[PDB]
Amino acid sequence: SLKIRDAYTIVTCPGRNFVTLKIVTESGTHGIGDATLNGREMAVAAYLDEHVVPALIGRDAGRIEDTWQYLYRGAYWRRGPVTMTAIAAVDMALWDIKAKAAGMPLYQLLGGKSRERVMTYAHCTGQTIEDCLGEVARHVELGYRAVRVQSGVPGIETTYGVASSLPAEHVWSTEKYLNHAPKLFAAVRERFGDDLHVLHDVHHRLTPIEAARLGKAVEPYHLFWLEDCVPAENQESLRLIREHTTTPLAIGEVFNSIHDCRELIQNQWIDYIRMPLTHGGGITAMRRVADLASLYHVRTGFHGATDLSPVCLGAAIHFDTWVPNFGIQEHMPHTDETDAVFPHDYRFEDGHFLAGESPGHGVDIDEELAAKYPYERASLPVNRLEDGTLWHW
Amino acid sequence: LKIRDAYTIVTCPGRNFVTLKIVTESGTHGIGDATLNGREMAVAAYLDEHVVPALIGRDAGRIEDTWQYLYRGAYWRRGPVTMTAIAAVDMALWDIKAKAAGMPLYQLLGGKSRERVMTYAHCTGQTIEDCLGEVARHVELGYRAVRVQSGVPGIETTYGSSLPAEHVWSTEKYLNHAPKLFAAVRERFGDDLHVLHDVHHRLTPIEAARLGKAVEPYHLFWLEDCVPAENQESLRLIREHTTTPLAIGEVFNSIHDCRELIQNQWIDYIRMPLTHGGGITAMRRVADLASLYHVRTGFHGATDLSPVCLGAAIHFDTWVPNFGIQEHMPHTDETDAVFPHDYRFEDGHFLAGESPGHGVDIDEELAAKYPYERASLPVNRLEDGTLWHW
Numbered sequence: 001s002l003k004i005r006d007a008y009t010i011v012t013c014p015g016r017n018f019v020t021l022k023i024v025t026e027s028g029t030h031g032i033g034d035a036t037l038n039g040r041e042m043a044v045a046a047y048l049d050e051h052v053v054p055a056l057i058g059r060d061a062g063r064i065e066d067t068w069q070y071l072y073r074g075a076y077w078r079r080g081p082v083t084m085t086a087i088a089a090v091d092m093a094l095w096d097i098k099a100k101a102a103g104m105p106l107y108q109l110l111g112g113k114s115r116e117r118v119m120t121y122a123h124c125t126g127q128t129i130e131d132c133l134g135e136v137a138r139h140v141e142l143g144y145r146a147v148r149v150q151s152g153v154p155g156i157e158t159t160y161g162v163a164s165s166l167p168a169e170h171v172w173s174t175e176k177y178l179n180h181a182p183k184l185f186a187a188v189r190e191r192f193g194d195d196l197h198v199l200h201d202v203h204h205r206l207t208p209i210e211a212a213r214l215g216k217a218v219e220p221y222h223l224f225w226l227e228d229c230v231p232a233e234n235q236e237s238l239r240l241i242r243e244h245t246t247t248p249l250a251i252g253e254v255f256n257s258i259h260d261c262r263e264l265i266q267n268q269w270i271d272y273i274r275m276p277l278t279h280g281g282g283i284t285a286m287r288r289v290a291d292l293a294s295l296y297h298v299r300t301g302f303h304g305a306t307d308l309s310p311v312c313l314g315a316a317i318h319f320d321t322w323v324p325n326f327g328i329q330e331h332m333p334h335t336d337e338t339d340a341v342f343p344h345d346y347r348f349e350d351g352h353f354l355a356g357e358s359p360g361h362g363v364d365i366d367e368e369l370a371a372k373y374p375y376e377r378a379s380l381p382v383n384r385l386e387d388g389t390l391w392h393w
Numbered sequence: 394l395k396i397r398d399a400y401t402i403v404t405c406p407g408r409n410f411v412t413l414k415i416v417t418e419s420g421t422h423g424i425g426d427a428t429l430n431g432r433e434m435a436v437a438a439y440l441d442e443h444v445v446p447a448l449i450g451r452d453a454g455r456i457e458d459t460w461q462y463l464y465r466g467a468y469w470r471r472g473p474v475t476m477t478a479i480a481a482v483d484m485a486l487w488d489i490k491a492k493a494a495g496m497p498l499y500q501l502l503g504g505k506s507r508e509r510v511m512t513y514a515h516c517t518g519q520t521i522e523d524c525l526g527e528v529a530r531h532v533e534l535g536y537r538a539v540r541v542q543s544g545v546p547g548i549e550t551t552y553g554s555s556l557p558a559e560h561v562w563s564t565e566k567y568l569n570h571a572p573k574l575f576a577a578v579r580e581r582f583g584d585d586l587h588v589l590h591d592v593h594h595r596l597t598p599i600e601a602a603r604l605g606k607a608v609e610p611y612h613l614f615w616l617e618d619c620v621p622a623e624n625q626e627s628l629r630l631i632r633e634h635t636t637t638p639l640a641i642g643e644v645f646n647s648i649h650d651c652r653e654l655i656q657n658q659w660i661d662y663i664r665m666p667l668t669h670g671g672g673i674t675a676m677r678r679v680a681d682l683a684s685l686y687h688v689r690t691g692f693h694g695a696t697d698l699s700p701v702c703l704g705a706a707i708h709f710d711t712w713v714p715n716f717g718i719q720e721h722m723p724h725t726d727e728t729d730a731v732f733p734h735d736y737r738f739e740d741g742h743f744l745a746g747e748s749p750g751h752g753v754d755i756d757e758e759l760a761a762k763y764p765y766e767r768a769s770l771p772v773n774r775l776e777d778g779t780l781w782h783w
């Protein structure tokens with residue numbers, strides 16, 4: 001039967017913390033899902049262990065939609081990063097099981113392939129503009145068609161995306177950054193030309209009119225996207241940016257629900273939605289987000305940093321392979337130790353991912369190997385202004 | 394003055410509660426409610442593993458900076474687990490601040506705006522008649538306001554074994570039955586009594602519009618939680634079609650869950666309580682936004698918010714200009730013993746405490762006598778098996 005016999009979390013730190021849900025059916029078939037929430041990992045682990053897992057036992061594993069609604073509505077307190085990550089982990093494991101039962105790779109189950117490979121972007125970072133440019137050259141040589149560029153801001157010790165369990169404390173100056181950033185993109189274009197796709201992550205630090213100014217300043221450099229311009233709990237925060245610049249906009253890695261972005265999409269305030277499988281309620285929910293996005297010409301650009309496990313990456317590559325309105329897939333390679341803990345069949349070649357062909361999402365976990373790497377607490381940084389004001393990191 | 398220690402206490406004197414205690418280098422302490430019904434251990438872990446270590450050494454007096462540090466610093470913002478952890482810290486810090494000031498909490502917030510805090514009681518029964526008996530009984534205790542719920546004939550379970558109980562639901566049967574309850578309450582008890590009703594998420598907007606209109610003759614104090622409101626626009630049809638007052642928000646945790654509801658004048662009462670809404674710091678901002686639009690506070694006050702929340706809420710209720718009403722579900726004697734407090738209930742109303750802080754403490758030795766026991770909230774299915782809203 002497809003009745004659930006067992007379900008449990010695995011916590012491991014093969015270079016960084018990962019939490020994984022495993023679901024095992026009465027017939028012995030199993031599925032896994034990513035439950036990793038960077039810097040708050042044990043909150044999801046406990047949400048799953050104490051409150052979700054006992055309710056999964058005896059459930060029909062084939063009932064994906066019912067389980068999703070049961071956990072989403074049944075929680076009573078709806079949405080949220082801990083909440084939606086727990087739900088995502090269950091959803092991914094159930095889709096893994098369904099695809100295995102169907103004898104198909106996940107992309108086939110979703111509606112089959114819409115493309116022959118999945119374009120990625122790489123992180124190019126450096127202290128100086130020159131340092132970053134060197135990194136762009138290296139990745140272009142590796143075959144990347146797209147690069148995210150970040151560089152230090154002169155007069156500021158720490159800037160995002162440029163180079164102990166408690167939050168590190170960074171210092172920020174918006175005004176210095178606003179004057180410096182356009183110089184980076186100018187230098188990229190001068191050295192590498194127009195065919196390269198160039199991305200930039202603002203990482204929440206601006207107000208809307210400041211982001212509008214930046215967007216206008218970087219129009220000549222034709223960025224693939226300007227990402228996370230402003231905190232967007234208030235979705236209307238995007239409107240001034242959109243009304244003032246034609247630089248394409250990306251947002252959403254911090255979102256967990258379609259209700260965090262319904263308005264952003266329907267009002268045409270963004271070009272790319274960034275919310276990934278692990279944090280956005282899994283395959284079931286993200287299919288719905290991508291479909292809504294498609295009505296408004298919005299494309300997917302999944303958050304793909306290392307704090308999403310190979311389980312998320314494999315499932316995302318399947319999703320990317322099917323989804324009509326695919327935009328790009330972020331690539332941050334995992335460590336060798338992480339890759340070994342999570343055997344998988346997706347492949348990376350010449351700047352692109354290729355989806356696996358084995359039934360399931362194609363990712364597994366080696367539990368005995370995972371057990372060799374105990375959890376190590378690690379928190380994300382905070383950002384303060386020059387006067388000490390607790391700002392957005 | 395720095396935080397020297399912070400830790401959670403988990404206890405089950407009749408039901409589960411999670412509490413955060415913060416202690417300073419001068420040996421002063423404060424506590425905050427961290428209870429999230431049916432997901433309690435997620436908050437416990439959020440605090441234990443991720444928040445508590447970052448509190449050590451922080452200036453206890455920096456309430457605002459700490460709130461922002463935890464809220465923005467989490468990176469992943471908002472949510473029930475997140476905002477409850479933040480609320481627990483915030484309540485404990487306000488507790489310490491008031492104690493440092495030598496004042497009960499309401500004094501710190503801006504002083505007294507009213508002499509007492511009106512409550513409502515839960516009145517419930519299988520039949521309308523059963524419910525009416527409960528109303529009579531509560532009116533005799535001095536309640537000026539009652540929430541009324543009764544069973545729907547033809548349906549085994551209506552709103553108002555560690556796993557979710559499974560209830561069955563019929564909207565159509567409820568819609569036809571509910572007006573009869575309010576009619577009976579008015580027929581027996583007259584017009585002076587305030588009468589409330591909790592729809593408990595089960596309707597679509599046009600169904601709630603229909604219900605609102607149908608119950609206009611009974612002049613309800615509020616119709617609560619008509620529809621799931623993740624999509625805040627869900628309230629619009631209800632508001633355009635009825636003048637029955639509307640309340641919502643016990644399942645919210647952020648001002649961003651209700652900013653539009655308030656600004657578009659779609660609701661009359663906001664229900665989000667201190668424990669789940671990010672504590673005093675955040676709820677002051679929510680109540681203040683509400684005030685621009687004639688919206689009043691109606692804090693969720695069920696038993697799954699601890700006496701720590703209740704004491705702090707009574708202080709808040711005593712200060713806030715735009716107070717509407719305070720929900721009252723009495724805690725068990727065992728719960729009251731675990732959480733000694735100085736708020737009082739008299740003649741249908743709360744009276745705020747006068748001792749410095751929010752006036753609530755926790756007896757840790759007694760708390761230890763009641764270990765955690767897993768308990769989940771129910772789910773609701775339609776007659777065809779559809780997983781619905783409970």
Ligand SMILES: O=C(O)[C@H](O)[C@@H](O)[C@H](O)[C@H](O)CO
Nearest residue numbers: 038201253303304305306307
């Ligand atoms: O675009 C990105 O890749 C993200 O912004 C990351 O840099 C985040 O900071 C990290 O994933 C948080 O856990």
Ligand SMILES: O=C(O)[C@H](O)[C@@H](O)[C@H](O)[C@H](O)CO
Nearest residue numbers: 430591643694695696697720
């Ligand atoms: O109005 C109320 O009192 C609430 O709706 C409660 O009945 C909730 O069901 C309970 O607090 C959930 O934890």
Ligand SMILES: [Cl-]
Nearest residue numbers: 080082472474
């Ligand atoms: Cl959450």
Ligand SMILES: [Mg+2]
Nearest residue numbers: 201227228253
């Ligand atoms: Mg980013």
Ligand SMILES: [Mg+2]
Nearest residue numbers: 591617618643
């Ligand atoms: Mg209610």
Ligand SMILES: [Mg+2]
Nearest residue numbers: 629632633634
């Ligand atoms: Mg009209």
